[PDB]
A paper describes a structure:
Two crystal forms were obtained for the archaeal aFap7–aRps14 complex bound to ADP/Mg2+ and ATP/Mg2+, which diffracted to 2.1 Å and 2.4 Å, respectively. In the ATP-bound crystal form, two copies of aFap7 are bound by ATP and two others by ADP. The structures of the ATP- and ADP-bound complexes showed only small, local conformational differences in the actual ATP binding site. The base, ribose, α, and β phosphates of ATP superpose perfectly on those of ADP, and the residues of the P-loop are in the same conformation in both structures. However, the presence of the γ phosphate of ATP is not compatible with the position of Arg100 (LID domain) in the ADP-bound state. This arginine, involved in binding the α and β phosphate oxygen atoms in the ADP-bound structure, bridges the α and γ ATP phosphate oxygens. Interestingly, the conformational change in the LID domain modifies the positions of Tyr102 and Lys106 side chains, which interact with the Rps14-CE Asp124. In the Apo-hFap7 structure, Arg100 would clash with the ADP phosphates, and the LID domain is even more distorted. This suggests that the LID domain undergoes major conformational rearrangements upon nucleotide binding and/or release and that Arg100 could sense the ATP binding pocket occupation state and relay this signal to the Rps14 binding interface through the LID domain residues Tyr102 and Lys106.
Amongst the factors involved in this maturation step, Fap7 is unusual, as it both interacts with ribosomal protein Rps14 and harbors adenylate kinase activity, a function not usually associated with ribonucleoprotein assembly. Fap7 forms a complex with Rps14 that is conserved between humans, yeast, and archea. We report that Fap7 association blocks the RNA binding surface of Rps14 and, conversely, Rps14 binding inhibits adenylate kinase activity of Fap7. In addition, the affinity of Fap7 for Rps14 is higher with bound ADP, whereas ATP hydrolysis dissociates the complex.
Numbering used by the authors:
A (entry chain H): 8 to 129
B (entry chain G): 0 to 179
Write the structure that this text describes.
């Protein structure tokens, strides 16, 4: 029997002002690592930057690996406009940074939240 | 005419603020959902109302043109208005309020996340140049309305980027959808 590995979930949030990478275990009850753009960069104006997203993802991935996480499934929240739907390069940049740090990448799902109740659009 | 849209994540206080503001401004309050029902765009099925947005924009443009109106709804920023006001609140507040409304755990979670990632704000900025963001946290409706009228009278047509909820992320973890 050849089988191994411990997998987590990387919750990735791309907002207007920032990026968050929150890594949990598969159950989602335990927090493995939590990093945002605001934690890795000095200036407010650089917090939304995809470079900051990559750096935060790098820190998160390192922390997760040291705690024994071999790979992660990704759950992405990447809001974009209603006119032009532009999520931005940030979430993808974060995912790539997770891979480059040595994490395996599993399923990638876009869970981007849609506010609802009131009138219902199509 | 002056058409002002009041939008934001469900639970943030759109209706409260819109009514108080319309009264204090001497404008007329219009709830977008009900308006959608009147023009026959909206169809109500058990109990949600489905509409086609382009039609609603068409009717809003047509009927209200021409008027002084405070428009209340989370779709209001998708309408052809003169000014958009986006209300923000600490996502925990959203969670508690929607929790009191009886929403499902998943629905609460999605709307709380929606506030976390600034979804409505991003939509509004994509749709309009004139967007005023207002943080409702630890404020009374009175203070919020006077803040809004104050900014309009300044006048300021655009203010955005005033909240970053990533800083409060841990506090909202119990409401989020993290489950495997
Ligand atoms: N500034 C505020 N301070 C305290 N409570 C508020 C405030 N604004 C709204 N609320 C409360 O929050 C709840 C939801 O407000 P509501 O206007 O229905 O939000 P929305 O219209 O965005 O769904 C109401 O029960 C209301 O009493
Ligand atoms: Mg409302
Ligand atoms: Mg900040």
């Amino acid at each position: 029997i050849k089988k191994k590995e411990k997998w987590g979930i990387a919750h990735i949030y791309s907002s207007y002002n920032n990026t968050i990478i929150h890594i949990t275990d598969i159950t989602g009850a335990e927090t493995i690592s939590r990093w945002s753009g605001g934690m890795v960069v000095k200036a407010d104006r650089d917090e939304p930057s995809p470079y900051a997203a990559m750096l935060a993802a790098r820190r998160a991935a390192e922390e997760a690996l040291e705690k024994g996480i071999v790979g992660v499934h990704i759950r992405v929240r990447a809001p974009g406009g209603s006119k032009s739907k532009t999520p931005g390069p940030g979430a993808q940049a974060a995912i790539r940074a997770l891979a480059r740090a040595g994490l395996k990448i599993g399923r990638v799902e876009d869970v981007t939240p849609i506010p609802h109740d009131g009138t219902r659009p199509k | 005419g002056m058409l002002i849209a009041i939008t934001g994540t469900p639970g943030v206080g759109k209706t409260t603020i819109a009514k108080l503001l319309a009264e204090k401004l001497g404008y007329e309050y219009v709830n977008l959902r009900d308006f959608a029902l009147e023009k026959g765009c909206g169809r109500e099925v058990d109990g949600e109302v489905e509409v086609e947005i382009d039609e609603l924009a068409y009717f809003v443009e047509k009927e209200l043109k021409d008027r002084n109106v405070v428009l209340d709804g989370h779709l209001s920023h998708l309408m052809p208005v003169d000014l958009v006001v986006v209300l923000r609140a600490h996502p925990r507040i959203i969670g508690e309020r929607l929790r009191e409304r009886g929403y499902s755990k998943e629905k609460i979670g999605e709307n709380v996340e929606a506030e976390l990632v600034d979804a409505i704000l991003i939509e509004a900025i994509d749709e309009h140049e004139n967007v005023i963001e207002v943080d409702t946290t630890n404020k009374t409706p009175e203070e919020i309305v006077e803040e809004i009228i104050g900014l309009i009278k300044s006048g300021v047509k655009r203010r955005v980027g005033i909240v970053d909820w990533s800083e409060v992320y841990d506090e909202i973890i119990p409401y989020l959808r993290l489950g495997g």
